[PDB]
Design an enzyme around this catalytic site. Structure first.
Site, PDB file in Angstrom:
ATOM      1  N   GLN A   1       0.812  -1.209   0.000  1.00 34.04           N
ATOM      2  CA  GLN A   1       0.000   0.000   0.000  1.00 34.04           C
ATOM      3  C   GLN A   1       0.869   1.293   0.000  1.00 34.04           C
ATOM      4  O   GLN A   1       0.552   2.267  -0.662  1.00 34.04           O
ATOM      5  CB  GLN A   1      -0.901  -0.047   1.198  1.00 34.04           C
ATOM      6  N   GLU A   2       1.977   1.292   0.722  1.00 33.40           N
ATOM      7  CA  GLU A   2       2.867   2.456   0.736  1.00 33.40           C
ATOM      8  C   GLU A   2       3.639   2.715  -0.551  1.00 33.40           C
ATOM      9  O   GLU A   2       3.607   3.813  -1.043  1.00 33.40           O
ATOM     10  CB  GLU A   2       3.842   2.371   1.904  1.00 33.40           C
ATOM     11  N   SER A   3       4.319   1.702  -1.090  1.00 32.74           N
ATOM     12  CA  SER A   3       5.238   1.915  -2.207  1.00 32.74           C
ATOM     13  C   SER A   3       5.035   0.996  -3.399  1.00 32.74           C
ATOM     14  O   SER A   3       5.706   1.157  -4.380  1.00 32.74           O
ATOM     15  CB  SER A   3       6.668   1.727  -1.739  1.00 32.74           C
TER      16      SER A   3
END
Ligand SMILES: CC(C)[C@H](N)C(=O)O
Length: 424
Positions: free
Chosen positions: A280-282
């Site tokens: 989800q972040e990167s």
């Protein structure tokens, strides 16, 4: 002279036969699960009995066990609905879809199945569909296997062993996140309900309890909650995002899997959750950077890095170590009686939006007479942090609390997806 129902109740066991398939029954960290497992376990609970699952070698085996005396009471197996077999009311509308390999010639209609290499499960409604097509186009050729499941035919299309398969849309959707090269060519038929199968006969005693259960299940949202969880990936991620997840799982995750796993061991935390955060972040990219000087695979601020002893945020090992320590620390600070799983979903909100704005959302929950220790209630409040009307009333003001609800939902979904194809 005990009825089918009385038999179950006296044995105090419900014996259900199913398929060995992700779409129906399999095991995770916490034991048995899957759509048909969870659905059938609520049926056994309703009846006040123990669920016992059997699995068949193939669909002809599965239907043969049902026609045996002493065999399973019912089959819960994503079955498309003979005195030997009776169906319940239907519980989910699925569409048969022809599946092809990205970059090859997309068939657009049934006649285009000719000249393609095509396999389906032996004894399936898919094979019947094709049997009917072949009467119209004698030149149609297809093979049936009784040694394979549907997920295996999707893998054969994916890696190129066959040109085409025919599969139910709910199964496609669930597995589209694992096979990056499979695509829906078209819909070979309109939606039709799935149903549980029971032994044939004139005794409708269990059949009526089955149908009352399914009625209840539809009434309360149970079927739809199960469907969104297992079969909802394309609806929630989009079609492209779901197959892109497959790409990234196959090509990106292997570079970081051991990092993730070591962290999990170190922090006593399920590593697929940590990988889910990274996704989800990167999208598992070590180089990613944002506007606001947050960077690396887990998206860490400089403070977090410093606090966590992370020299270089562009190092993936480092970013995963500190991101994962930080998640676990946030999760640890939350009020002690908040239990898992909410504990973890609050920790995910905090990871994304920070303790301050979370606190404001929990306070807003309380001022609304909802529970600030209940995830679903706080979830209801978070989007408000982006609406003027409500962020006016908050100590720390505006935050992207709608993005946060999306972040928690997706991480939860990614975590599920990784759980079902990996080891703990
Ligand atoms: C089980 C699956 C392959 C399909 N719904 C069928 O009933 O044959």
């Amino acid at each position: 002279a005990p009825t089918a129902l009385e038999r179950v109740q006296k044995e105090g066991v419900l014996r259900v036969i199913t398929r060995n398939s992700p779409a129906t029954y399999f095991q995770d960290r916490n034991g048995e699960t899957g759509f048909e497992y969870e659905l059938a376990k609520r049926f056994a609970e309703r009846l006040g009995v123990e669920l016992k699952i059997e699995t068949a070698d193939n669909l002809d085996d599965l239907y043969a066990q049902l026609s045996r005396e002493g065999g399973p009471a019912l089959a819960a197996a994503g079955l498309t609905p003979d005195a030997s077999v009776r169906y319940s009311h239907t519980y989910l509308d699925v569409t048969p879809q022809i599946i092809y390999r990205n970059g090859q010639q997309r068939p657009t209609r049934p006649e285009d199945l000719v000249g393609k290499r095509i396999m389906v499960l032996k004894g399936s409604s898919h094979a019947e569909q094709l049997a009917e097509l072949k009467k119209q186009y004698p030149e149609l050729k297809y093979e049936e296997s009784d040694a394979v499941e549907v997920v295996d035919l999707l893998r054969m299309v994916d890696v190129g062993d066959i040109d085409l398969t025919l599969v139910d849309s709910n199964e496609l959707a669930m597995n589209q996140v694992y096979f990056p090269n499979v695509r829906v060519a078209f819909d070979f038929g309109e939606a039709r309900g799935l149903a549980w199968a029971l032994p044939g006969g004139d005794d409708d005693s269990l059949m009526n309890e089955v149908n009352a259960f399914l009625d209840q299940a539809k009434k309360e949202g149970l079927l739809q909650r199960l469907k969104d969880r297992y079969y909802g990936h394309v609806d929630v991620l989009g079609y492209v995002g779901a197959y892109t997840f497959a790409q990234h799982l196959q090509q990106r995750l292997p570079r970081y899997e051991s990092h993730f796993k070591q962290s999990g061991k170190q922090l006593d935390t399920d590593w697929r959750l940590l990988a889910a955060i990274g996704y989800q972040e990167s999208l598992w990219q070590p180089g990613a950077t944002s506007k606001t000087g947050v960077r690396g695979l887990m998206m860490l601020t400089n403070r977090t890095a410093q606090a966590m002893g992370v020299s270089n945020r562009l190092d993936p090992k480092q970013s995963i170590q500190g991101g994962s320590k930080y998640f676990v620390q946030i999760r640890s600070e939350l009020p002690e009686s908040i239990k898992e799983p909410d504990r973890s979903w609050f920790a995910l909100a905090a990871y994304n939006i920070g303790g301050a704005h979370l606190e404001d959302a929990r306070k807003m929950a309380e001022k609304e007479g909802l529970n600030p220790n209940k995830w679903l209630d706080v979830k209801k409040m978070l989007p408000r942090l982006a609406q003027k009307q409500w962020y006016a009333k908050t100590r720390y003001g505006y935050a992207r609390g709608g993005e946060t609800v999306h972040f928690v939902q997706n991480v939860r979904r990614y975590y599920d997806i990784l759980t079902w194809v990996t080891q703990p």
